[PDB]
Design a protein around this ligand. Structure first.
Ligand SMILES: Nc1nc2c(ncn2[C@H]2C[C@H](O)[C@@H](COP(=O)(O)OP(=O)(O)OP(=O)(O)O)O2)c(=O)[nH]1
Ligand SMILES: [Ca+2]
Ligand SMILES: [Ca+2]
Ligand SMILES: [Ca+2]
Length: 344
DNA sequence: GGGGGAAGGATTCT
DNA sequence: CACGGAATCCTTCCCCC
């Protein structure tokens, strides 16, 4: 309004909390949601865990085996994505009743442009307690709210107040963070980028202002360059806009690695059958076969057709692209799947 | 010189 | 890496005005 007022909501340890909601008997105990790859007994990884377990180091990304090694007595539940998704949607609807300007950024977070629903942050903070309280009431889900002048800082405000919290980073505090904040804690800055920036001499957002663009561009790319410089100059003002799915796909892990076409197909087709059920009523013009090689490397191959793709065409083309992969790469394949995009 | 795609890879999401 | 999506961006290549 004078400048945006963004309200960001991020659901606390989502998948695990949902499981808690569906079985409150779990509350207070360490809960670990798992992704069993079927390779052996407990092969796989943790999708997420609640804070009770997270304090002992059990968090998203670690092998289930190491999790059990740390907390052999925690409750281990298999991931139930669809259920979580439906719980997510109902909540997104609640939020949708606090602003038409809503951006569902992921399965458990969203930005709300509340510039014309409040003036000054006090009214914002209160509107956050209002929303937090509302959600807790209707779905018994705790969330963390973040408020600031733009999407990035609202999210940062959230990361700082997790879990079940709420924080406001006023315009004056942004100035402090632009200099105080660790560059790696900036959204979109993963380990790889974090490093490329270290070497360059950037450790705080402020530092991107003292380097020459062209150099910074060649090191982390133009897009990421302008992004950081925007935040640095305190000129980041990306608008909140409704995002719509552009891709739908599934990829499974094989019992054993392989390069034998007939051994891989059953998995590939299974991925297709599920990808299709999920496409719902959407018709894709583009298809990509995706394979994870034995050394966790990802190779893909695809084709865009001038028309929509039928299930039959998907089966036939997928086999061709899979062959193109086996043909152009010697590695064994560990995970195989498909991705459909460019919906009509 | 440069628009517009398409394809395959790189990163991020914490 | 010991899942499993999904978005965006980079580089290269291609057709061609
Ligand atoms: N399979 C899989 N799922 C993930 C992964 N990371 C996150 N998810 C899923 C399950 C998480 O509960 C859900 C929400 O992501 P968040 O980063 O907000 O994690 P959580 O919500 O557990 O984090 P938080 O409470 O905000 O610290 O997305 C991952 O690495 N693998
Ligand atoms: Ca989140
Ligand atoms: Ca969360
Ligand atoms: Ca990071």
């Amino acid at each position: 309004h004078h400048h945006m007022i963004v309200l960001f909501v991020d659901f606390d340890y989502f998948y695990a909390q949902v499981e808690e909601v569906l079985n409150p008997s779990l509350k207070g105990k360490p809960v670990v949601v798992c992704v069993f790859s079927g390779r052996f007994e407990d092969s796989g990884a943790v999708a997420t865990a609640n804070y009770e377990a997270r304090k002992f180091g059990v968090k998203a990304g670690i092998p289930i085996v190491e999790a059990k090694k740390i907390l052999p007595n925690a409750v281990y539940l298999p991931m139930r994505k669809e259920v979580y998704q439906q719980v997510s949607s109902r909540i997104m609807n609640l939020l949708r009743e606090y602003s038409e300007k809503i951006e569902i950024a992921s399965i458990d977070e969203a930005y709300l442009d509340i510039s014309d629903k409040v003036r000054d942050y006090r009214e914002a903070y209160n509107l956050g307690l209002e929303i937090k309280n509302k959600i807790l009431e209707k779905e018994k889900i705790t969330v963390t709210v973040g408020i600031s002048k733009n999407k990035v800082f609202a999210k940062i405000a959230a990361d700082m107040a997790k879990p079940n919290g709420i924080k406001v980073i006023d315009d004056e505090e942004v100035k402090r963070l632009i200099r105080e904040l660790d560059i790696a804690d900036v959204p979109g800055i993963g380990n790889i980028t974090a490093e490329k920036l270290k070497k360059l001499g950037i450790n705080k957002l402020v530092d991107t202002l003292s380097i020459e663009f062209d150099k910074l561009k060649g090191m982390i790319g133009e897009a990421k360059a302008k992004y950081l410089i925007s935040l640095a100059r305190d000129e980041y003002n990306e608008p909140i806009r409704t995002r719509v799915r552009k891709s739908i796909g599934r990829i499974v892990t094989m019992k054993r690695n392989s390069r034998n076409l007939e051994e891989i197909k059953p998995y590939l087709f299974r991925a297709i059958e599920e990808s299709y059920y999920k496409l719902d009523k959407r018709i894709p013009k583009a298809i990509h076969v995706v394979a994870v090689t034995e050394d966790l490397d990802i190779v893909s191959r695809g084709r865009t057709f001038p028309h929509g793709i039928s299930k039959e065409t998907a089966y036939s083309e997928s086999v061709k692209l899979l062959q193109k992969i086996l043909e152009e790469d010697e590695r064994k394949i560990r995970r195989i799947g498909v991705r459909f995009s460019k919906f009509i």
